[PDB]
CSV table of C-alpha atoms (C1' of nucleotides) and ligand atoms in Angstrom, one decimal:
chain,number,residue,atom,x,y,z
A,16,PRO,CA,0.0,0.0,0.0
A,17,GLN,CA,1.1,3.6,-0.6
A,18,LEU,CA,0.6,6.6,1.7
A,19,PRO,CA,-3.1,7.2,0.8
A,20,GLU,CA,-4.0,3.6,1.4
A,21,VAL,CA,-2.1,3.6,4.7
A,22,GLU,CA,-4.1,6.7,5.8
A,23,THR,CA,-7.3,4.8,5.0
A,24,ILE,CA,-6.1,1.8,7.1
A,25,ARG,CA,-5.3,4.1,10.0
A,26,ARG,CA,-8.8,5.7,9.9
A,27,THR,CA,-10.7,2.4,9.4
A,28,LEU,CA,-8.6,0.2,11.7
A,29,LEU,CA,-8.7,2.5,14.8
A,30,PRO,CA,-12.3,2.0,15.9
A,31,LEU,CA,-12.0,-1.7,15.4
A,32,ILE,CA,-9.2,-1.9,18.0
A,33,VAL,CA,-9.4,1.1,20.3
A,34,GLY,CA,-9.9,0.2,24.0
A,35,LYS,CA,-9.1,-3.4,23.5
A,36,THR,CA,-6.5,-5.0,25.8
A,37,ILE,CA,-3.8,-7.3,24.4
A,38,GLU,CA,-3.8,-10.8,25.9
A,39,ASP,CA,-1.3,-12.5,23.6
A,40,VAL,CA,1.0,-11.8,20.6
A,41,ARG,CA,1.8,-14.7,18.2
A,42,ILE,CA,4.6,-14.5,15.7
A,43,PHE,CA,5.0,-16.8,12.7
A,44,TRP,CA,7.8,-15.0,10.8
A,45,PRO,CA,10.2,-13.4,13.4
A,46,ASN,CA,12.2,-11.5,10.8
A,47,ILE,CA,9.3,-9.0,10.7
A,48,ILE,CA,10.1,-8.1,14.3
A,49,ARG,CA,12.9,-5.5,14.2
A,50,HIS,CA,12.8,-4.2,17.8
A,51,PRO,CA,13.2,-5.6,20.4
A,52,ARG,CA,15.3,-7.9,18.2
A,53,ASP,CA,14.1,-10.8,20.2
A,54,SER,CA,10.5,-11.5,19.1
A,55,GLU,CA,9.8,-13.1,22.5
A,56,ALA,CA,10.5,-9.7,24.2
A,57,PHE,CA,8.4,-8.0,21.6
A,58,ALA,CA,5.4,-10.3,22.4
A,59,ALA,CA,5.9,-10.2,26.2
A,60,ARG,CA,6.0,-6.4,26.6
A,61,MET,CA,2.8,-5.9,24.7
A,62,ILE,CA,0.6,-8.2,26.8
A,63,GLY,CA,-1.6,-6.3,29.2
A,64,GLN,CA,-1.5,-3.1,27.3
A,65,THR,CA,-4.6,-1.5,25.9
A,66,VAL,CA,-4.8,0.1,22.5
A,67,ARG,CA,-5.3,3.9,23.0
A,68,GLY,CA,-4.7,5.3,19.5
A,69,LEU,CA,-3.4,4.9,16.0
A,70,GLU,CA,-1.4,7.5,14.1
A,71,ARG,CA,0.4,7.6,10.7
A,72,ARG,CA,3.8,9.0,9.8
A,73,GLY,CA,4.6,8.7,6.1
A,74,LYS,CA,3.8,5.1,5.3
A,75,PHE,CA,4.4,4.0,8.9
A,76,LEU,CA,1.5,3.2,11.3
A,77,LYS,CA,2.0,4.0,14.9
A,78,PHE,CA,-0.2,2.1,17.3
A,79,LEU,CA,-0.3,3.8,20.7
A,80,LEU,CA,-0.7,1.6,23.8
A,81,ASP,CA,-0.4,2.3,27.5
A,82,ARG,CA,3.4,2.6,27.8
A,83,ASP,CA,4.6,1.6,24.4
A,84,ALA,CA,4.1,2.5,20.7
A,85,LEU,CA,4.1,-0.2,17.9
A,86,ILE,CA,5.6,1.2,14.7
A,87,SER,CA,4.5,-0.9,11.6
A,88,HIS,CA,5.4,-0.7,7.9
A,89,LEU,CA,3.5,-2.8,5.3
A,90,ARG,CA,6.0,-2.4,2.5
A,91,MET,CA,4.5,-3.7,-0.9
A,92,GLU,CA,1.9,-6.2,0.2
A,93,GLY,CA,1.3,-6.1,4.0
A,94,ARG,CA,-2.3,-5.9,5.2
A,95,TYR,CA,-4.1,-5.8,8.6
A,96,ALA,CA,-7.5,-7.3,9.5
A,97,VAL,CA,-9.6,-7.7,12.6
A,98,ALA,CA,-11.4,-11.0,13.1
A,99,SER,CA,-12.5,-13.7,15.5
A,100,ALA,CA,-9.9,-15.9,17.3
A,101,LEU,CA,-12.4,-18.8,16.5
A,102,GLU,CA,-11.9,-18.6,12.7
A,103,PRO,CA,-9.0,-20.1,10.7
A,104,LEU,CA,-6.2,-17.6,9.7
A,105,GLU,CA,-5.9,-16.6,6.1
A,106,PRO,CA,-2.8,-17.6,4.1
A,107,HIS,CA,0.5,-15.6,4.7
A,108,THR,CA,-0.5,-14.4,8.2
A,109,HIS,CA,2.8,-13.7,10.1
A,110,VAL,CA,1.8,-11.8,13.2
A,111,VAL,CA,-1.4,-11.8,15.4
A,112,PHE,CA,-2.3,-9.6,18.3
A,113,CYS,CA,-5.0,-11.4,20.4
A,114,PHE,CA,-7.4,-9.2,22.5
A,115,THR,CA,-9.2,-10.1,25.8
A,116,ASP,CA,-12.5,-9.9,24.0
A,117,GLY,CA,-11.7,-12.8,21.7
A,118,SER,CA,-11.0,-10.7,18.6
A,119,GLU,CA,-7.6,-10.4,16.9
A,120,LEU,CA,-5.6,-8.0,14.9
A,121,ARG,CA,-3.9,-10.0,12.1
A,122,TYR,CA,-0.9,-9.0,9.9
A,123,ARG,CA,-0.6,-10.7,6.5
A,124,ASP,CA,2.2,-10.3,4.0
A,125,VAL,CA,2.9,-12.6,1.0
A,126,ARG,CA,6.3,-11.0,0.5
A,127,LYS,CA,7.3,-10.8,4.2
A,128,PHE,CA,8.9,-7.4,3.7
A,129,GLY,CA,7.0,-5.6,6.4
A,130,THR,CA,8.5,-4.5,9.7
A,131,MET,CA,7.5,-3.9,13.3
A,132,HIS,CA,9.4,-2.0,16.0
A,133,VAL,CA,8.1,-1.4,19.6
A,134,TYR,CA,9.5,1.3,22.0
A,135,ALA,CA,8.3,3.3,25.0
A,136,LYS,CA,6.0,6.0,23.5
A,137,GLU,CA,8.4,8.8,24.5
A,138,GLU,CA,11.3,7.1,22.5
A,139,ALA,CA,9.5,6.1,19.3
A,140,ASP,CA,10.1,9.3,17.4
A,141,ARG,CA,13.8,9.4,18.2
A,142,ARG,CA,14.5,5.8,17.2
A,143,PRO,CA,14.3,3.9,13.9
A,144,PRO,CA,12.5,3.6,11.7
A,145,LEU,CA,10.9,7.0,12.5
A,146,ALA,CA,14.1,8.9,13.3
A,147,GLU,CA,15.1,11.1,10.4
A,148,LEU,CA,11.7,10.8,8.7
A,149,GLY,CA,11.1,13.9,6.6
A,150,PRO,CA,8.0,16.0,6.8
A,151,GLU,CA,4.5,14.9,5.8
A,152,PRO,CA,4.0,15.8,2.1
A,153,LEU,CA,0.6,17.4,3.1
A,154,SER,CA,2.0,19.5,5.9
A,155,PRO,CA,3.3,23.1,5.8
A,156,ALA,CA,6.6,21.6,6.9
A,157,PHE,CA,7.1,20.2,3.4
A,158,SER,CA,7.6,23.4,1.4
A,159,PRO,CA,9.0,24.3,-1.9
A,160,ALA,CA,11.8,25.8,0.1
A,161,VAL,CA,12.6,22.6,1.9
A,162,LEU,CA,12.5,20.7,-1.4
A,163,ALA,CA,14.8,23.3,-3.1
A,164,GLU,CA,17.4,23.0,-0.3
A,165,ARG,CA,17.6,19.3,-0.7
A,166,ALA,CA,17.6,19.4,-4.5
A,167,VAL,CA,20.6,21.7,-4.7
A,168,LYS,CA,22.7,19.7,-2.4
A,169,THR,CA,22.7,16.4,-4.2
A,170,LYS,CA,24.0,14.9,-7.5
A,171,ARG,CA,21.2,12.3,-7.6
A,172,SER,CA,18.2,12.3,-10.0
A,173,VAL,CA,15.0,14.1,-9.0
A,174,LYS,CA,13.3,10.7,-8.8
A,175,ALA,CA,15.9,9.5,-6.3
A,176,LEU,CA,15.3,12.6,-4.3
A,177,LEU,CA,11.6,12.2,-4.0
A,178,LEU,CA,11.9,8.5,-3.1
A,179,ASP,CA,14.2,9.6,-0.2
A,180,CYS,CA,12.3,9.2,3.1
A,181,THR,CA,14.4,11.9,4.8
A,182,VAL,CA,13.3,14.5,2.1
A,183,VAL,CA,9.6,13.8,2.4
A,184,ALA,CA,7.7,11.1,4.3
A,185,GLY,CA,6.4,8.1,2.3
A,186,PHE,CA,6.1,9.4,-1.2
A,187,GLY,CA,6.2,6.3,-3.4
A,188,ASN,CA,7.0,5.3,-7.0
A,189,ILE,CA,3.5,5.6,-8.4
A,190,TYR,CA,3.2,9.2,-7.0
A,191,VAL,CA,6.7,10.1,-8.0
A,192,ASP,CA,6.2,9.2,-11.6
A,193,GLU,CA,2.7,10.7,-11.7
A,194,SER,CA,3.9,13.9,-10.0
A,195,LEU,CA,6.9,14.2,-12.4
A,196,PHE,CA,4.6,13.7,-15.4
A,197,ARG,CA,2.2,16.4,-14.1
A,198,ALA,CA,5.1,18.8,-13.5
A,199,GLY,CA,6.6,18.1,-16.9
A,200,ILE,CA,10.0,16.9,-15.6
A,201,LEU,CA,11.9,13.8,-16.7
A,202,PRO,CA,12.6,11.5,-13.8
A,203,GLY,CA,16.2,11.1,-14.8
A,204,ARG,CA,17.0,14.8,-14.6
A,205,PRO,CA,19.6,15.7,-12.0
A,206,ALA,CA,17.7,17.1,-9.0
A,207,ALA,CA,20.2,20.0,-8.9
A,208,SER,CA,19.3,20.8,-12.5
A,209,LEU,CA,15.8,21.9,-11.6
A,210,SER,CA,15.0,25.6,-11.7
A,211,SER,CA,13.1,27.4,-8.9
A,212,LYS,CA,10.1,27.3,-11.2
A,213,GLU,CA,10.4,23.5,-11.7
A,214,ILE,CA,10.8,23.0,-7.9
A,215,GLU,CA,7.7,25.1,-7.2
A,216,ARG,CA,5.7,23.2,-9.8
A,217,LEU,CA,6.9,19.8,-8.7
A,218,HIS,CA,6.0,20.6,-5.1
A,219,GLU,CA,2.5,21.8,-6.2
A,220,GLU,CA,2.0,18.6,-8.2
A,221,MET,CA,3.2,16.4,-5.4
A,222,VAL,CA,0.8,17.9,-2.9
A,223,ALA,CA,-2.1,17.8,-5.5
A,224,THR,CA,-1.3,14.2,-6.6
A,225,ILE,CA,-1.1,12.7,-3.1
A,226,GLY,CA,-3.7,15.0,-1.7
A,227,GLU,CA,-6.2,13.9,-4.3
A,228,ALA,CA,-5.5,10.2,-3.6
A,229,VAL,CA,-5.8,10.6,0.2
A,230,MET,CA,-9.3,12.1,-0.3
A,231,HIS,CA,-6.8,8.1,-13.6
A,232,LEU,CA,-3.1,7.4,-14.1
A,233,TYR,CA,-1.0,9.2,-16.8
A,234,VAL,CA,2.1,7.2,-16.9
A,235,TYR,CA,2.5,4.6,-14.1
A,236,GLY,CA,2.1,1.1,-15.6
A,237,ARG,CA,1.1,2.6,-19.0
A,238,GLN,CA,4.3,1.7,-21.0
A,239,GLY,CA,3.6,1.2,-24.7
A,240,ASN,CA,0.2,3.0,-24.4
A,241,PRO,CA,-0.4,6.5,-25.8
A,242,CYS,CA,0.1,9.4,-23.4
A,243,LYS,CA,-3.3,10.7,-22.4
A,244,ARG,CA,-2.1,14.3,-23.2
A,245,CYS,CA,0.0,13.9,-26.4
A,246,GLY,CA,-0.5,10.4,-27.7
A,247,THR,CA,3.2,9.6,-27.6
A,248,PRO,CA,3.9,6.1,-26.4
A,249,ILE,CA,4.7,6.0,-22.7
A,250,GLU,CA,8.2,4.6,-22.0
A,251,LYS,CA,9.5,2.6,-19.1
A,252,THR,CA,13.2,2.5,-18.1
A,253,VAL,CA,15.2,2.1,-15.0
A,254,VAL,CA,15.8,5.3,-13.0
A,255,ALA,CA,17.2,5.4,-9.4
A,256,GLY,CA,17.2,1.6,-9.6
A,257,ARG,CA,13.4,1.5,-10.1
A,258,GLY,CA,10.9,0.9,-12.9
A,259,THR,CA,10.1,4.4,-14.1
A,260,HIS,CA,7.4,5.6,-16.5
A,261,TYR,CA,7.3,8.8,-18.4
A,262,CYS,CA,6.2,10.5,-21.6
A,263,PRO,CA,9.3,11.6,-23.6
A,264,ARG,CA,7.4,14.4,-25.1
A,265,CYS,CA,5.5,15.9,-22.2
A,266,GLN,CA,8.5,15.6,-19.8
A,267,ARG,CA,11.8,17.4,-20.3
B,4,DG,C1',29.4,12.7,5.1
B,5,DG,C1',26.9,11.7,0.7
B,6,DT,C1',25.8,7.5,-2.4
B,7,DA,C1',25.9,3.5,-4.8
B,8,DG,C1',25.3,-1.2,-4.1
B,9,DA,C1',23.1,-4.9,-1.2
B,10,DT,C1',19.3,-6.8,1.0
B,11,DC,C1',14.9,-9.4,1.9
B,12,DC,C1',11.1,-12.7,-0.4
B,13,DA,C1',8.1,-15.2,-3.5
B,14,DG,C1',5.1,-14.3,-7.7
B,15,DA,C1',5.6,-13.1,-12.5
B,16,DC,C1',8.1,-14.1,-16.7
C,22,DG,C1',17.0,-19.0,-14.6
C,23,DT,C1',16.0,-13.9,-14.0
C,24,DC,C1',13.6,-9.7,-12.4
C,25,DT,C1',11.3,-6.9,-8.9
C,26,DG,C1',11.0,-3.6,-4.6
C,27,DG,C1',11.1,0.4,0.9
C,28,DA,C1',13.8,1.7,3.7
C,29,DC,C1',22.4,-1.0,6.4
C,30,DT,C1',27.5,-1.4,4.8
C,31,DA,C1',31.1,0.3,2.8
C,32,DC,C1',33.3,3.1,-1.1
D,4,ZN,ZN1,2.8,13.1,-23.5
DNA sequence: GGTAGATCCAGAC
DNA sequence: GTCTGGACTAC
């Protein structure tokens, strides 16, 4: 899931778990547990705590308990569901939080790329994976000025810059490619090569593109198909090590 | 200290 | 078999 989908999860999941008390934590792929490194300590500390809130930072979910926070990233394919402890688990279920009311919060992930970190609440924001996270793309803290400052410093492509979590929180490939198309900028352009006008426009399209989604594609996944604005075949190449889509006529 | 390269996984070719 | 992707290690 990308940022908009994660925000939907935050909103919809919260009322399904708030006020429930954890009675057990079961782990079927320990590699997902990143802190404490020992999955047994992860499970033990959570027991007895009640879910009090659920926040989002970038693509991270932050579950707020009594003393601790659970920081969760779904990567490409992770998903949460709430269901009865009486029913069989769905395939690829790797972590389960069991509540005292006989319901469960289940984490599934076919690829097993997702991560979980638990810390005392007061520490979570100053430890990985939240430490160094850049500003929310929809916040005044992410400004053209901030983007400009980062762009001028680096030798990397503009795509690489936007994918950088320290620059802006949780802005993924689909939105990078779409935002760059909408801003008329080739993804392979050196970030430092962007003019003030291009930075301003890119910021505007980033906020618009992801803002629209949080509340229909031009290039992403459209290789070999006509651009919706000029009819030129959309191309796909590798940029910043990732599959990257663009129109060679609309973007410069 | 900034950056490329490496990494994890299993489904799609 | 090869390719793919979000967010330490070593040049
Ligand atoms: Zn075009």
